[PDB]
Symmetry: C5
Subunit: 307 residues, 5 copies
């Protein structure tokens, strides 16, 4: 059972696709194992780049194909390198840019916590043939957190395991466990942009909605919530067109639903204030003055949606 020791060097994690639950990783794989000793020129290690690697594989060099289990599509492999040592050991070094897949929950956007994952697994060789000895992951990142969209928490957490593959086994009974390296990088979204540019003005819109009650006439009170309604639509349009695509409501979506709610609720009280009377124009002196009543009724219903 060949021991393969791995090092992944992560260069940039970028381009998160909310819809596809996808993110881009550029970096390097280094894979090392020990073969039977060789005679290299001089005595110095033999270097074999790109094209020539296939030539060595033809003359019988075992260079096992390691699949990125959760890569969507197949990665752009940059340069490849075989490092063949005379003491026997073999190093395969190559650059890759890949699009990777992971479960991503975006429901509390723009306050999501996500985690970026890599899954390596030898493509054709079982655990009894090729085994992952160890893995080091190097996230050569740090600093400039507010210039980048995401805050990396940890240093990269790792777990090597055995996967079975209990569908038709049968082919090779007793031996259908593959060893799998699983690298996880934890991360937090830097919400500033979304707070100041989406959350804040959506609030000023929402708040200023409640100023509909400081209007004197019923005609004023009502004709204005129609403009005010048109505003939340202008906003939802502005919001939706800019924000990441998801198949669900995020927190910001709910804020917008709440805007439609306060305003539609406003419409109802306002019409109600007017026509519920003991004459015709008996506008409920206190209900018309719910100018404080439901702004804080919104903030109570607001603090409960937080739970």
């Amino acid at each position: 059972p060949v021991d393969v020791s791995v090092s992944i060097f992560i260069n940039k994690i970028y381009g998160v696709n909310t819809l596809e639950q996808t993110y881009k990783v550029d970096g390097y794989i280094v894979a090392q194992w020990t073969g039977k000793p060789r005679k290299t020129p001089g005595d110095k290690p033999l270097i074999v780049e790109n094209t020539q690697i296939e030539r060595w594989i033809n003359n019988g060099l075992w260079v096992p194909a390691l699949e990125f289990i959760n890569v969507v599509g197949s990665p752009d492999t940059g340069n490849k390198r075989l490092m063949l040592f005379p003491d026997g050991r073999v190093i395969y070094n190559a650059r890759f840019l890949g699009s990777f897949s992971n479960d991503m929950d975006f429901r509390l956007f723009p306050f999501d916590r996500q985690q970026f994952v890599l899954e390596l697994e030898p493509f054709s060789y079982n655990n009894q043939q090729l085994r992952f000895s160890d893995i080091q992951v190097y996230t050569e990142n740090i600093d400039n957190e507010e210039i980048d969209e995401w805050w990396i928490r940890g240093k990269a957490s790792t777990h090597i395991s055995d996967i079975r593959y209990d569908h038709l086994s049968s082919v090779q009974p007793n031996q259908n466990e593959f060893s799998r390296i699983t690298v996880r990088i934890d991360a937090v979204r830097n919400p500033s942009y979304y707070l100041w540019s989406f959350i804040l003005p959506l609030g000023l819109i929402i708040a200023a909605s409640w100023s509909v009650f400081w209007l004197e006439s019923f005609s004023e009170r009502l004709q204005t919530s129609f403009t005010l309604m048109l505003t939340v639509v202008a906003y939802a349009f502005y919001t939706s067109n800019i924000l990441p695509r998801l198949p669900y409501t995020t927190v910001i979506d709910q804020m917008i639903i709440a805007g439609y709610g306060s305003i539609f609720a406003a419409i109802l009280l306002i019409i109600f204030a007017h026509h519920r009377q003991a004459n015709g124009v008996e506008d409920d002196l206190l209900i018309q003055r719910c100018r404080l009543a439901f702004p804080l009724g919104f903030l109570a219903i607001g603090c409960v949606l937080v739970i």
Copy 2:
């Protein structure tokens, strides 16, 4: 007639193109058929990965090309593996990402039922040369329905059948039936996002539209439905910029039309109210008070569109 056994492993079904009637399928194919026995190194099955498979083919390994009938474009093939057993049998295993085509009706969106389909068929060998012995499909999915756009329902239908290509047959008469594997995976759309952020406020807009009759003045009444019209336009827009491209009207698309209708029907009633008179300002006390007439008249005419 070579018996070929297939097993398809479905990893991710994503990216439905509504206009193109398209979806993405990531997975693995395993194909097995049995040959004349080989003398393999050691005695354990021989592994041939990617490039070396072509090398084996140039030397006469029969690897029959299995075509994805309904793949739009030609799939992204990942690692390929030939697994050659001494008892003769041959296993072809490769990872694939493909764009598949199937008839998709999205009329009752966002509540569509869809079925993601795969059709396998040997590219050059007929039922009398190469035959599909059996096929199993494994969708090793589970959990997180409320996170995903699509909810898979069954375990996946399978069907092997025989296709008669009766166009110039003639070339090889009597032997022009190809055997076809058909996988069908049932699905339902996640209607939550479309309900809460589209259906709901669209209703509040349509509903608030009716509050125009609670206005005292005629000029207020009329000038108002023009802001109100401007609303359903800004809203139809927000919908169409965000919702999926189609060549037909969905349930939402209709709501928008009924939206335009209520307002335009209103405008007419309002002018009628005013100008159908025996003086100038004889507003039909009852017709100006059709505040209940067409709000509940909209629910009957609205629900008849459901039949």
Copy 3:
């Protein structure tokens, strides 16, 4: 002069690009021609799939390149197959997906009739070297038009001709006419979406524009016409974002220009009615009541557009 029988089987015609004048065709080419008899294994027809065709060609197999004349870029090719019969004859079968070029008039959108074309031609052999014996095209489609964007009308037109490249001929004089196959598929656009979701409400906006004249005051008449204008801009905006980009105006675009007009004409009359007076508010006592005059005056200006 080698006789080539061609047969194209059309699977999907999708993805029309209105600015670039483009469409996608997925299907298969089958080309048949006859060589000197071969000694094939058994005596049965010899099959050569993908990778191997190029190999036979290094050993002198003439497999002439047939070019897609009006293809944009170079086609996505699926599986290749040579079918080599012992009596001499040779059949080439391949799958393709290509983006094709053709003149397309979209002036009468959403009611265009279009025709999707394939133009095949030998890439290197003239009419005296390679000639198209015949060509048949099978678009084994039918049914479900109300699901697809386009409705195919005919069964496909065919045309074999001779193309005379008379630019420097000279090199090989008297012999530079290549034989060309031309396929034609007629189609009609499915106007349903555009009828209900563009034409109808745009008609309602314009119609409701005319309701400006039932407004009592001048202040009312002119201000409401500003909202009216903004609704046509909001509509102008919703139209252009969803509708296909063209370098010319369609029918829907004109309805829009007509909209801005009916509204701008009213602005002018409305100011006129009021300021053309013998006192100050002498709205030409009758002209303000052109409530019927220019709506049907619009429909006549509308039918002058039948020309």
Copy 4:
């Protein structure tokens, strides 16, 4: 010094990318030169299609690589052809699709004059080794300009010149001038769509803005200018979503700023009119009756854009 004759046949010029200063050119390249006499099968010219050309190159056939100096990326090449004549001469024919770069000024859009340029040059051979003997360009386009976005004007300009790369020469001193073919194709934009759907309504918006002065009251005069303001924004938007992305203002863009200006200037005058007084309500019966004054001040700013 090898004499090479070139002929380019342009099939389609399309897809102008304003931002990147790029356009697509599809066509064929033909190059002819005279080698040492050969013995071809029969004695008529030998044809070598695609794959097979490298094979001929591997055996010492000089097929010199001619680079498209201004191509963005590397061209999509379709079928390749070698034509080997017994008298020595060699013909290289290939189809290409390329994105080419040239300086493009889009300021006076939608009436720009652009020129599509192709630049050809041997990649590895200097003027003393390989020289462009002559070149002719064929624009086999014609008819129906009214359906196409761009109108090709001339019959294509041609220039063979010598480029002196005087950077370290040194390597090969006295000999580092490359021969360069320059093709120029002038064209004009189809101004129809933009005149009718941008300029005409952009104008009617700006014009109707001026009706603010026929409003009687000060509220009306001031408040409407705000609604009037929102319209130039909504119009600014539609303009921006549809029109080409540039790093500078176009004519229309300036038209839009002028819309914003006329309205902001009106805001001031309207306020000035009201408050420049000898009472409170000394509304300049005249400055409020600059109803003719500043529409022609706009026609003046309009004619100043020409100076």
Copy 5:
């Protein structure tokens, strides 16, 4: 320790992706080194183009792969050229187009200062095997600055350095410093388009907002502030849709925030003016006439955000 002399020729720097922090570079690499003397045809340096380069490599030509350290994905390579001299020296020449990554701060857009960076380093060989003797960069760009998006300021930066990978060294101890060429080009953004088309009209929007205090009534003062609010939303939208996407606010983003605030402060002062009284309509003679107060109060807070 092989001396490699490098020269980069920059053709075009374009296509900057703000979210990915990406930009496109088209140009040429020249690499020169001296090997052991060769026997070339004639005595003139031998030319080996594209395809034939690998053929020389398979015969043992050392052609070391130079990695673009900071490239995103792997470059589109055009023509390659090997120039093999009799005296030993070898020149590698290739055109390339790549997307490169560099840290980009876009906080004070549109008044950005950026620097476009290229990083070269041998993929497999350290400082002791392969060393960069010198490098010159030629950016033969100039002029028409007001036509191109970015104004290249300095000439070109050059820095050869030694990178110490101190990760498992071990494998090759004492020798794991690679020599790195770093090219820096400074550039400044052309702020014209965003000034004249964004900054300016945004300013006129904000300013014309303050005129709400010149309105006589409270309803005039309040209701208009809502149309004023919807106008900022409209502008936010138009801005957002056109401007480059980033994860943080730029200057324009703040202007919009300031716009939202100014309107909300107005909603407040205005309601307050009205209800802070000793009667009911005692509109504070100074606070109603904060017509100068907070137009200038915005200018100090506007001037303090700059400092």
